[PDB]
Amino acid sequence: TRNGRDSQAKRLGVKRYEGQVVRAGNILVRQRGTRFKPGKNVGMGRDFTLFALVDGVVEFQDRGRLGRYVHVRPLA
Amino acid sequence: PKMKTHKGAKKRVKITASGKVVAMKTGKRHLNWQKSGKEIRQKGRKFVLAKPEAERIKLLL
Amino acid sequence: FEGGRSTTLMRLPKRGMQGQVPGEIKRPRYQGVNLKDLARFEGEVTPELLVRAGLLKKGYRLKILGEGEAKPLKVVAHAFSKSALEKLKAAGGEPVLLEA
Amino acid sequence: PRLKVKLVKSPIGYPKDQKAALKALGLRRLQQERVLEDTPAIRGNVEKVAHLVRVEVVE
Amino acid sequence: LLLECTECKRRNYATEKNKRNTPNKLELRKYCPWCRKHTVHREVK
Amino acid sequence: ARLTAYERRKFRVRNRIKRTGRLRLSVFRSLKHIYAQIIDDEKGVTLVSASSLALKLKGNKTEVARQVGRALAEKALALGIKQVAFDRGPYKYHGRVKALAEGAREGGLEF
RNA sequence: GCGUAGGGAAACCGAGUCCGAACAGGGCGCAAACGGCCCGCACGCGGGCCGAAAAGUCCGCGGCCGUGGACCCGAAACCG
RNA sequence: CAGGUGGAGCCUGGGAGUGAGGGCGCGAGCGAUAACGUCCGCGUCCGAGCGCGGGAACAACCGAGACCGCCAGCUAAGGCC
RNA sequence: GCGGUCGCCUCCUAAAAGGUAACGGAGGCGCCCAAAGGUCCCCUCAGGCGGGACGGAAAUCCGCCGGAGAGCGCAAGGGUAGAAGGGGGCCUGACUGCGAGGCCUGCAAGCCGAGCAGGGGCGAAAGCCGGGCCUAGUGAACCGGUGGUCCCGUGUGGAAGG
Ligand SMILES: [Mg+2]
Ligand SMILES: [Mg+2]
Ligand SMILES: [Mg+2]
Ligand SMILES: [Mg+2]
Ligand SMILES: [Mg+2]
Ligand SMILES: [Mg+2]
Ligand SMILES: [Mg+2]
Ligand SMILES: [Mg+2]
Ligand SMILES: [Mg+2]
Ligand SMILES: [Mg+2]
Ligand SMILES: [Mg+2]
Ligand SMILES: [Mg+2]
Ligand SMILES: [Mg+2]
Ligand SMILES: [Mg+2]
Ligand SMILES: [Mg+2]
Ligand SMILES: [Mg+2]
Ligand SMILES: [Mg+2]
Ligand SMILES: [Mg+2]
Ligand SMILES: [Mg+2]
Ligand SMILES: [Mg+2]
Ligand SMILES: [Mg+2]
Ligand SMILES: [Mg+2]
Ligand SMILES: [Mg+2]
Ligand SMILES: [Mg+2]
Ligand SMILES: [Mg+2]
Ligand SMILES: [Mg+2]
Ligand SMILES: [Mg+2]
Ligand SMILES: [Mg+2]
Ligand SMILES: [Mg+2]
Ligand SMILES: [Mg+2]
Ligand SMILES: [Mg+2]
Ligand SMILES: [Mg+2]
Ligand SMILES: [Mg+2]
Ligand SMILES: [Mg+2]
Ligand SMILES: [Mg+2]
Ligand SMILES: [Mg+2]
Ligand SMILES: [Mg+2]
Ligand SMILES: [Mg+2]
Ligand SMILES: [Mg+2]
Ligand SMILES: [Mg+2]
Ligand SMILES: [Mg+2]
Ligand SMILES: [Mg+2]
Ligand SMILES: [Mg+2]
Ligand SMILES: [Mg+2]
Ligand SMILES: [Mg+2]
Ligand SMILES: [Mg+2]
Ligand SMILES: [Mg+2]
Ligand SMILES: [Mg+2]
Ligand SMILES: [Mg+2]
Ligand SMILES: [Mg+2]
Ligand SMILES: [Mg+2]
Ligand SMILES: [Mg+2]
Ligand SMILES: [Mg+2]
Ligand SMILES: [Mg+2]
Ligand SMILES: [Mg+2]
Ligand SMILES: [Mg+2]
Ligand SMILES: [Mg+2]
Ligand SMILES: [Mg+2]
Ligand SMILES: [Mg+2]
């Protein structure tokens, strides 16, 4: 057989769901492209990884044509 | 007979005041013509976990 | 033993300076005792007396350190901590040792 | 409107989360009756084991 | 081509990497030393 | 032909601005006049207005701009507002757009 | 001998120390437990006392581990 | 956010054994829409319930979790010439 | 046994979180780029039809139509023109000293990262910059080499060696 290979599962996906309490640092989404875009108080690292910029809670936003967004609405 | 301290362990590990086992960080002095300065810089000591229990046990003395 | 895999003998010694063949190098070892510790004494306090008390240990030279509060007594030692030299200069007097 | 639940069929061979419900209720033995507060949460488990239990309404 | 470029006194050796035969010149560029601050930095060894 | 260098360049520069979080000093300039608007996004609301067609002034529109520039400061700085970003939209930071910005002096600024 | 000081490769300093330009930051570290009797204002205080308890350490016992034949029996073999 | 006091949960530690699984159901790959085949997934039982009832006999299908005693009663599956 | 395989990335298998096996179905990595890096400013494709010397299916040009089927150094996927793509100007942050907090996770590793300080780059500024659209381009420890630097230097000053 010429096959037999594969790579390590990269455990990608959302790490904090809407209405979850996070903290400045907490990475909120692990993804390949820009499947989710950084919203309010949400940074995104060189591997497109979204994280809380401040403490607070997590909320999602589907801006249709404009894509989907993860916001960290404060409370801190 | 008297137990023997493990010199391999003593040469590369330290037991802290609270009984933590603190070792250096692997992978920073051999192949770094360029790893990120963040990479080579993040080489202080760390703490081994639940298995320094074993390292501790070969230094005891 | 980890079953054949390399163990955690895979970390690199830092404690560089492991010693060489003629051996350990003779040099004055200082042992620190705190102010709070000798607060029990009244009279003198010499590195000699402090062994009998059970604090000094015979192989080491005397160095009094900070933690604790000072007392108006004459304390004889080989070295004093910054914090300690001050703490007691406000009460008592203390000599430095270096004879024989 | 309290509920009277009664274990009538053995859970030997049913999913573990179903043995969990029979527990959440307090049912430990066959034929055992237990009268509990009729609430949404308490009904959840009662209808989950609906095939092993027999339910009546009581005062 | 593994590369280790240095400063201009007390050495330094903050190593980088130029792959090819072009850049093939002195292969130098402005960088920052751990000592003073921001100097020339040239390439060697 | 969907979207244009205009509409594009407009978003491009304006999208960046809206990230930094500050209040937006949006500048719309026309052939005859030049207007200025301090907007707060997330509240979707304007705070301080300052036009030239609203101050009925004229005479050399690079010099008019600066006037409506200083005009925006006064009105605004009196409301607490000090620090802001400054749009610029489709217009290169130049001429009467640059002028109004240079006029926005006497009020928070950094520009 | 163990314990009463730790941090550092070390020099060394020390309730701190190490990295550092840092009076950033972080790593690893220091912080007396109760009752009650005394007093500074009375219901505790603030610190002390009277002895409960205890870091620690010592011996006994028990589990388990390290080294030894190490739960018992058994090779094919190797060497003098 | 609520109910849920359970041989529940969490934390620190002492002692382990296991690291050869198997049948069945369901979902796939391999195989031949073969195997009491094989490899995963989610469940279950046997494993350790080779104790009890049914299935003629039969680890895992149905019923049912056996602390002890009774020449008492009601039932489950399954049955009632 | 013979043959094949052995680490890393992509896709499916995988049963709509994560994860998941087989000598299951298919591909790819062991590099590369001083610009293919940072920043500021501009620019928008592929195709299709019509038009136009040498121009041909296709060289360069004009017109309309063309939301992305182009491009993004190479596999695949995800992503993406409201740029991550194309062009130019300055520049080298392919920084030093750190690091809140997390992702992942048996260990050891691997990954993302705000913010502070030093000294800088581009920008009017807001600001961005601790390499590259991202996910492969990799190797614990031991033993040594090389350049520094304080540190130790076996009676002492050196030196040897660390
Ligand atoms: Mg496989
Ligand atoms: Mg995969
Ligand atoms: Mg949806
Ligand atoms: Mg690289
Ligand atoms: Mg091996
Ligand atoms: Mg059953
Ligand atoms: Mg370097
Ligand atoms: Mg001890
Ligand atoms: Mg010491
Ligand atoms: Mg030490
Ligand atoms: Mg230093
Ligand atoms: Mg220092
Ligand atoms: Mg500090
Ligand atoms: Mg601390
Ligand atoms: Mg006692
Ligand atoms: Mg005792
Ligand atoms: Mg034994
Ligand atoms: Mg024998
Ligand atoms: Mg012989
Ligand atoms: Mg609750
Ligand atoms: Mg339990
Ligand atoms: Mg436990
Ligand atoms: Mg244990
Ligand atoms: Mg095994
Ligand atoms: Mg197995
Ligand atoms: Mg299996
Ligand atoms: Mg099983
Ligand atoms: Mg099974
Ligand atoms: Mg069978
Ligand atoms: Mg069926
Ligand atoms: Mg079968
Ligand atoms: Mg089988
Ligand atoms: Mg079943
Ligand atoms: Mg067995
Ligand atoms: Mg049975
Ligand atoms: Mg069972
Ligand atoms: Mg039998
Ligand atoms: Mg039987
Ligand atoms: Mg039978
Ligand atoms: Mg039977
Ligand atoms: Mg029972
Ligand atoms: Mg019974
Ligand atoms: Mg009957
Ligand atoms: Mg019946
Ligand atoms: Mg019959
Ligand atoms: Mg072979
Ligand atoms: Mg899945
Ligand atoms: Mg065309
Ligand atoms: Mg044509
Ligand atoms: Mg033509
Ligand atoms: Mg595409
Ligand atoms: Mg591609
Ligand atoms: Mg693609
Ligand atoms: Mg795509
Ligand atoms: Mg470009
Ligand atoms: Mg450029
Ligand atoms: Mg961390
Ligand atoms: Mg890696
Ligand atoms: Mg890359």
Ligand SMILES: [Mg+2]
């Ligand atoms: Mg070796």
Ligand SMILES: [Mg+2]
């Ligand atoms: Mg060496």
Ligand SMILES: [Mg+2]
């Ligand atoms: Mg070496």
Ligand SMILES: [Mg+2]
């Ligand atoms: Mg010297």
Ligand SMILES: [Mg+2]
């Ligand atoms: Mg000698």
Ligand SMILES: [Mg+2]
């Ligand atoms: Mg000498």
Ligand SMILES: [Mg+2]
């Ligand atoms: Mg050397």
Ligand SMILES: [Mg+2]
């Ligand atoms: Mg040297």
